[PDB]
Short mmCIF file of C-alpha atoms and ligand atoms in Angstrom, two decimals:
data_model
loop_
_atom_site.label_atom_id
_atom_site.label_comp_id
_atom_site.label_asym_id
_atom_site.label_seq_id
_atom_site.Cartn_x
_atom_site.Cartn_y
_atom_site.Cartn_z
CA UNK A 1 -76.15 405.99 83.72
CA UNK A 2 -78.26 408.80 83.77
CA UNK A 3 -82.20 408.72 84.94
CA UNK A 4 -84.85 411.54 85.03
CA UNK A 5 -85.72 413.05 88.33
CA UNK A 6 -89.44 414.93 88.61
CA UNK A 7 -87.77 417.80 90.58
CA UNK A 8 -84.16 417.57 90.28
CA UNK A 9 -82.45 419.94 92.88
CA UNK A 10 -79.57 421.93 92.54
CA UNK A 11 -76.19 420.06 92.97
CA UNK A 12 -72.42 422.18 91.77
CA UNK A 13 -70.42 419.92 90.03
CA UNK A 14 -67.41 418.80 91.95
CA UNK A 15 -64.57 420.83 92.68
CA UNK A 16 -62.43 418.46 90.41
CA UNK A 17 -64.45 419.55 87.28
CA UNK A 18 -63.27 423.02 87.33
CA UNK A 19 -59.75 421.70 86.70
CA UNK A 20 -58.75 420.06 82.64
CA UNK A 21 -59.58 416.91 81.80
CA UNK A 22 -57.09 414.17 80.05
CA UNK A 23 -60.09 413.33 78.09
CA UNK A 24 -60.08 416.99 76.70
CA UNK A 25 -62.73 417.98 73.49
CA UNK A 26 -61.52 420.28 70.86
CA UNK A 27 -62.30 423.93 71.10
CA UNK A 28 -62.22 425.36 67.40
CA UNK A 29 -62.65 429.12 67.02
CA UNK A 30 -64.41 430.05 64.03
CA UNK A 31 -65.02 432.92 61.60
CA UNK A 32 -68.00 433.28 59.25
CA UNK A 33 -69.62 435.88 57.60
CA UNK A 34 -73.49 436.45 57.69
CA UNK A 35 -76.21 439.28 57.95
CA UNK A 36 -74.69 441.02 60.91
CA UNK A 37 -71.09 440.85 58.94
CA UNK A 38 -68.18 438.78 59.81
CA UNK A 39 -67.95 437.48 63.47
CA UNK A 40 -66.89 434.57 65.18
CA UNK A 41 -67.69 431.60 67.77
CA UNK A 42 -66.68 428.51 69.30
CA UNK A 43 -67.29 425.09 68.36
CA UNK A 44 -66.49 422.67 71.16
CA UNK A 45 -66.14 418.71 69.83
CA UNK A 46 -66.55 416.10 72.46
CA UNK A 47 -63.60 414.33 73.06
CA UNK A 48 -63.43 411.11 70.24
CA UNK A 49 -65.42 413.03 68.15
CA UNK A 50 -66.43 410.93 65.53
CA UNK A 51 -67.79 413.04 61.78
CA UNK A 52 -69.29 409.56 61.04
CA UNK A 53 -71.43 409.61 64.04
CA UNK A 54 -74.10 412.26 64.53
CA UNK A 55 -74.10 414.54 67.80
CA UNK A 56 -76.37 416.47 69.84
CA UNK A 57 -76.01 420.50 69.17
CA UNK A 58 -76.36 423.10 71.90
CA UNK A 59 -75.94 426.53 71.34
CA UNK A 60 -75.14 428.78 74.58
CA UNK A 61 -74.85 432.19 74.52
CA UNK A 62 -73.22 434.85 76.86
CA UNK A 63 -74.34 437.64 79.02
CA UNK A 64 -74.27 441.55 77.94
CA UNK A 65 -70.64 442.71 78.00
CA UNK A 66 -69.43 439.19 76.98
CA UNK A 67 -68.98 437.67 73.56
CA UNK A 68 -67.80 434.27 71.97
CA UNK A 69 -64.76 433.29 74.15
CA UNK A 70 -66.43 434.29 77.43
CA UNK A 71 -67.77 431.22 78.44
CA UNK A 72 -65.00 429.05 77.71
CA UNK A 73 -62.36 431.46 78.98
CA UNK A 74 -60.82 430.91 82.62
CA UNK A 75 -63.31 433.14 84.42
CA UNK A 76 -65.88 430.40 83.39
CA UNK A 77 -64.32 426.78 82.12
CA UNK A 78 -67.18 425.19 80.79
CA UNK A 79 -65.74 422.83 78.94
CA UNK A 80 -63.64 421.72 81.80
CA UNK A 81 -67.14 420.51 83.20
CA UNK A 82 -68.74 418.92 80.40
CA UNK A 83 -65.21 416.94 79.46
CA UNK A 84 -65.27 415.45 82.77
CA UNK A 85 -69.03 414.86 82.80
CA UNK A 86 -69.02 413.43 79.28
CA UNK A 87 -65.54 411.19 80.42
CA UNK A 88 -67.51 409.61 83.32
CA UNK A 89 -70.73 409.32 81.45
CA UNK A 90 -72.87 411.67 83.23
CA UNK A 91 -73.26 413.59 79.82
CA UNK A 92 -73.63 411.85 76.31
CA UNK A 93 -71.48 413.38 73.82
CA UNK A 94 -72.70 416.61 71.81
CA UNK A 95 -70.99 419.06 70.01
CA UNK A 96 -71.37 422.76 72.34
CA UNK A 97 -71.41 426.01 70.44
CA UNK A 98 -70.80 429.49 71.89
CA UNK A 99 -71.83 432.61 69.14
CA UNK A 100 -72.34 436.08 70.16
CA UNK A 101 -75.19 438.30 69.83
CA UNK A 102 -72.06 441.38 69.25
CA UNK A 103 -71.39 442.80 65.99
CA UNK A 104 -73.37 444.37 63.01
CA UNK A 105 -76.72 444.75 63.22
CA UNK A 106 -76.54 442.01 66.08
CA UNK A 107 -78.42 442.57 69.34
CA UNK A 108 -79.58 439.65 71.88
CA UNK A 109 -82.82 440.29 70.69
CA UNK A 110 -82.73 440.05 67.07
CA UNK A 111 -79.88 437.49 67.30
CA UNK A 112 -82.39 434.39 66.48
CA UNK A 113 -82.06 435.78 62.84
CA UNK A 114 -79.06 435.19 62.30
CA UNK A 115 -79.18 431.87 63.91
CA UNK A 116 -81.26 430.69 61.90
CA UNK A 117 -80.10 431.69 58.11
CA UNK A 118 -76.13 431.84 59.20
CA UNK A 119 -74.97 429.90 62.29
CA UNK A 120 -76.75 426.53 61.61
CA UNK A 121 -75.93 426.17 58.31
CA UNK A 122 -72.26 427.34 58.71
CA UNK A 123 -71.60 425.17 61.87
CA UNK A 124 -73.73 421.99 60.74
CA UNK A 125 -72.35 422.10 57.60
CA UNK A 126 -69.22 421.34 58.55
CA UNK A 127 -70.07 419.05 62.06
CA UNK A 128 -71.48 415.98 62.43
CA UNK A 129 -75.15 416.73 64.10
CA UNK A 130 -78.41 414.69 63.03
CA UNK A 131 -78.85 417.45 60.39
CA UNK A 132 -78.43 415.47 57.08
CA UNK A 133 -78.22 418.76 55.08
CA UNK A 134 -78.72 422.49 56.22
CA UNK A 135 -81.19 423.42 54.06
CA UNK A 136 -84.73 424.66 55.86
CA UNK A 137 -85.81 420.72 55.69
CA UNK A 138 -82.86 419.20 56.94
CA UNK A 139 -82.64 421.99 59.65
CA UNK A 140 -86.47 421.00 60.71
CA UNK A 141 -85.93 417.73 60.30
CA UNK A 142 -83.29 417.53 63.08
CA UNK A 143 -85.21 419.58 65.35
CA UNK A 144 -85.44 416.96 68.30
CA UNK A 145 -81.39 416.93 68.49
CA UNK A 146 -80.78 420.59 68.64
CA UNK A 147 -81.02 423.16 72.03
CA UNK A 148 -80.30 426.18 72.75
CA UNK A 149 -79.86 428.48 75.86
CA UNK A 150 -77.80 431.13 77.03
CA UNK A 151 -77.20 433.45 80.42
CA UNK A 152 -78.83 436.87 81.47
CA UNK A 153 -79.12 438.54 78.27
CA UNK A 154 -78.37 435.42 76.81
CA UNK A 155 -81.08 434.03 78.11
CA UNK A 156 -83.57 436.82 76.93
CA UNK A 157 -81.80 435.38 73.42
CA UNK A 158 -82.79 431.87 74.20
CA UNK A 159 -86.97 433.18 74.84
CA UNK A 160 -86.62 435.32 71.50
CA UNK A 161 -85.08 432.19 69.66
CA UNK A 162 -87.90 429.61 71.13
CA UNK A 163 -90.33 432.16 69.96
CA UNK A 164 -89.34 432.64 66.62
CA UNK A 165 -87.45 429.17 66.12
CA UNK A 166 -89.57 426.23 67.56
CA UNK A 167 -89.22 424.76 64.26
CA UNK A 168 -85.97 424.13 64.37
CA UNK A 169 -85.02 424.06 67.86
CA UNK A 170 -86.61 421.47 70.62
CA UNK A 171 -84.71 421.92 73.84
CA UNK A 172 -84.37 425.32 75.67
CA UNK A 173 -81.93 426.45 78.39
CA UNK A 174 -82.99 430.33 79.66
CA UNK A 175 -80.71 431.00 82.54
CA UNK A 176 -81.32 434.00 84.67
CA UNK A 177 -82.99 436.20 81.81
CA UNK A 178 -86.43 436.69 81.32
CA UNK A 179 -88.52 437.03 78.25
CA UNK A 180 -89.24 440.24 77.74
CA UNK A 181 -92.37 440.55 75.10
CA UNK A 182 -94.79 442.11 76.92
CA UNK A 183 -96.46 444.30 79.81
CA UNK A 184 -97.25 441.10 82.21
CA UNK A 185 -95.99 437.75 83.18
CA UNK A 186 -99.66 436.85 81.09
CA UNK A 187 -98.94 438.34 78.22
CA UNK A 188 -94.89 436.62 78.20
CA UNK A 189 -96.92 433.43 78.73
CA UNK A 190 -99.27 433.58 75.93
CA UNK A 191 -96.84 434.83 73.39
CA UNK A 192 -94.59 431.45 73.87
CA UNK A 193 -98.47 429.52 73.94
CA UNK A 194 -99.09 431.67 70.68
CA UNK A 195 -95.89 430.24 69.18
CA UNK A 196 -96.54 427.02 69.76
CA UNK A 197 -99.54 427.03 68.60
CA UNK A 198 -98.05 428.28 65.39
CA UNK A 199 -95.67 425.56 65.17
CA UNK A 200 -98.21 423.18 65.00
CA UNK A 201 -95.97 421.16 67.41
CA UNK A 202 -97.22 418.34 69.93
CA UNK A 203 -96.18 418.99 74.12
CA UNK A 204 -93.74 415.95 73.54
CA UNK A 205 -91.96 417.75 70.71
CA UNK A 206 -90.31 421.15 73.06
CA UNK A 207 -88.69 421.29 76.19
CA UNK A 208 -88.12 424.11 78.75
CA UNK A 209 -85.55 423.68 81.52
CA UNK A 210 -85.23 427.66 82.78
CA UNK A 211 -83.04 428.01 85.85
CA UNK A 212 -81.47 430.41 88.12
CA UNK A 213 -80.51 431.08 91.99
CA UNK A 214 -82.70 431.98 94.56
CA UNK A 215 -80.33 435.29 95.35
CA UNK A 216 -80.00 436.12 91.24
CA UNK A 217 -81.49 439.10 90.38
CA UNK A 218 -83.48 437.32 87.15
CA UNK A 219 -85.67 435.50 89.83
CA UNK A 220 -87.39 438.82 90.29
CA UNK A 221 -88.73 438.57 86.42
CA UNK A 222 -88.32 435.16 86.06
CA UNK A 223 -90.49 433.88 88.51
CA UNK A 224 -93.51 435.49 87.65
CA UNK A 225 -93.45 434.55 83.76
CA UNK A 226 -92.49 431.32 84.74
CA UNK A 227 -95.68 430.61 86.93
CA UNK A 228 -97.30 432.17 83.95
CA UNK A 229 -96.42 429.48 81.78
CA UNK A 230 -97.63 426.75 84.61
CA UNK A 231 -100.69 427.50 84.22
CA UNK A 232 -100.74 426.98 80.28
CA UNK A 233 -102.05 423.69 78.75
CA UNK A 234 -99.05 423.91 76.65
CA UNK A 235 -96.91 423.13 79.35
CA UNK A 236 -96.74 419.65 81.91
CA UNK A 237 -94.35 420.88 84.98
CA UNK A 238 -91.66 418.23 85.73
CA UNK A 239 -87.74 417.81 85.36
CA UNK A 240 -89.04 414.03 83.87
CA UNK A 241 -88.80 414.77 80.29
CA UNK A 242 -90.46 411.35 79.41
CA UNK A 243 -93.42 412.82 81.04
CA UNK A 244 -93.70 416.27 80.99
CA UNK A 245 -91.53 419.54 78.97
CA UNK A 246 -91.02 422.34 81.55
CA UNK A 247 -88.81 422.81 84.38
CA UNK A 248 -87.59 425.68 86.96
CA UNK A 249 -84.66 424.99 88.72
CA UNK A 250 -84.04 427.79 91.42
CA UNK A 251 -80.04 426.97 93.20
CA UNK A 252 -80.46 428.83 96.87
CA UNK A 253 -77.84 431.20 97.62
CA UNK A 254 -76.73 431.21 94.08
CA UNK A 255 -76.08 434.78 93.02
CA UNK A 256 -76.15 436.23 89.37
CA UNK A 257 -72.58 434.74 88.73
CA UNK A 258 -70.83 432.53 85.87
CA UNK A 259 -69.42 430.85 88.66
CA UNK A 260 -72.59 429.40 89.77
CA UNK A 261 -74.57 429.38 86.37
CA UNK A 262 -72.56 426.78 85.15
CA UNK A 263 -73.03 424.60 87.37
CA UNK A 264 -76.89 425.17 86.20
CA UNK A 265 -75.99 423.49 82.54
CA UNK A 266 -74.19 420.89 84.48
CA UNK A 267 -77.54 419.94 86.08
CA UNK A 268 -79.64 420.90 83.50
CA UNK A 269 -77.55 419.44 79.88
CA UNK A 270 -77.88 415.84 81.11
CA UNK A 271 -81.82 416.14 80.66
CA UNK A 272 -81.72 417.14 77.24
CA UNK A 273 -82.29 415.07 73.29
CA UNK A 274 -82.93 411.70 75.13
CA UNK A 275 -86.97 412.42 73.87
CA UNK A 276 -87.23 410.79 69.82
CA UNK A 277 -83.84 410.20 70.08
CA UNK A 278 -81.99 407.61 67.94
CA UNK A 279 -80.49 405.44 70.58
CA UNK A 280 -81.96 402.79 72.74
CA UNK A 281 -81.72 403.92 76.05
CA UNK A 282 -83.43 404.17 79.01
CA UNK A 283 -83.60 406.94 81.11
C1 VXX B 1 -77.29 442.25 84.33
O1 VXX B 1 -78.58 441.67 84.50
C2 VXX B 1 -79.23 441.12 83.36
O2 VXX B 1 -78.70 441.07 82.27
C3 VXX B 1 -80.60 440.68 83.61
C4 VXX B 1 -81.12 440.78 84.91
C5 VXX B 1 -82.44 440.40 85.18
C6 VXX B 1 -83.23 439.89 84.16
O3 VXX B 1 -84.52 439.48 84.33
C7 VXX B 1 -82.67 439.78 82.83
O4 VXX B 1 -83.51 439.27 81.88
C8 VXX B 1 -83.10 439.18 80.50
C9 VXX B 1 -81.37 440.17 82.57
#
């Protein structure tokens, strides 16, 4: 069903989306204990969920003053939209996981450590993703099949995690958060190019769909950094993954809301892990 677009615009998922599915996945709250202590998060299986098949992972994290059950509490129903996009095909099935960057040491800055030594090998230990063990390798190894992204200060998580994580993460979702490493736009840019180059990793190996609205207060910070990043060899602007990485979707009138941001990862989560990916499909 689903094709790339080169500019893909803004639609809000139907009404009927907000509202459960009969087709519902499983949410499963879990507890785990790493280097910021013992906290929690949400797992969300797609419906069918199959531990013999191997999934897509997204990790999504909340804004400041949230934590773990925010997003898929009833002020923001997220999994009421990707049920229903997944049911109708819109949406391949993946496995949707929402931490918190609360507790401990914890902040949404440093959170990326943790991420990496405790959340992926608790949660992909025990869920079917293309990781075929959660050691480093296996972790690495999976890269293509794994994203991550996140909303306001969440999304200043998501630009610390690309920076620090490209080798294990290929698909990034900043929503209405800049990255804030630096004293210019310039400087954000060449930090992520900097990275990159570090990782060793070709253009066709990460992927950058940022969004916000055009009445959110991130577009003030956002915009800038992301014309930054334009102009970087590092980076081919289109929504067409199969030719380019690196994307800006602005919603107009949208206003620094859950109630419009996730409509963003309704638009945006269909464009993600169809690049290397195990299937034949075309897109
Ligand atoms: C409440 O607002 C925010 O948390 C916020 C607003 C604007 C930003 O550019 C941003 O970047 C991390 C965060």
């Amino acid at each position: 069903s689903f094709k790339y677009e080169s500019a893909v615009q803004y639609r809000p998922a139907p009404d009927s989306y907000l509202n459960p599915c009969p087709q519902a996945g499983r949410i499963v709250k879990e507890t785990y204990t790493g280097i910021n202590g013992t906290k929690s998060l949400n797992v969300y299986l797609p419906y069918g969920y199959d531990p013999n098949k191997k999934y897509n992972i997204f990790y999504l994290m909340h804004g400041g003053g949230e934590n773990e059950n925010t997003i898929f509490s009833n002020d923001v129903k997220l999994q009421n939209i990707l049920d229903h996009a997944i049911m109708n095909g819109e949406l391949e099935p993946l496995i949707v996981v929402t931490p918190t960057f609360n507790g401990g040491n914890c902040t949404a800055q440093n959170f990326y450590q943790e991420f990496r030594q405790n959340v992926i090998p608790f949660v992909e230990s025990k869920y079917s993703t293309y990781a075929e063990s959660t050691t480093p390798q296996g972790i690495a190894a999976s890269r293509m099949h794994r994203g991550f992204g996140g909303f306001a200060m969440g999304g200043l998580t998501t630009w610390y995690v690309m920076v620090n994580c490209l080798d294990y993460v290929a698909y990034f979702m900043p929503l209405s958060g800049d990255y804030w490493y630096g004293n210019s736009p310039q400087d954000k840019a060449n930090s992520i190019a900097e990275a990159i180059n570090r990782s060793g990793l070709s253009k066709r190996e990460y992927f950058v769909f940022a969004a916000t609205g055009s009445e959110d207060i991130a577009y003030a910070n956002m915009n800038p950094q992301i014309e930054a990043m334009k102009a970087l060899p590092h980076f081919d602007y289109t929504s067409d993954f199969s030719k380019g990485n690196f994307y800006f979707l602005v919603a107009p009138g949208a206003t620094h809301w859950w109630g419009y941001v996730r409509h963003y990862i309704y638009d945006a989560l269909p464009y993600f892990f169809h690049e290397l990916e195990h299937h034949h499909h075309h897109h």
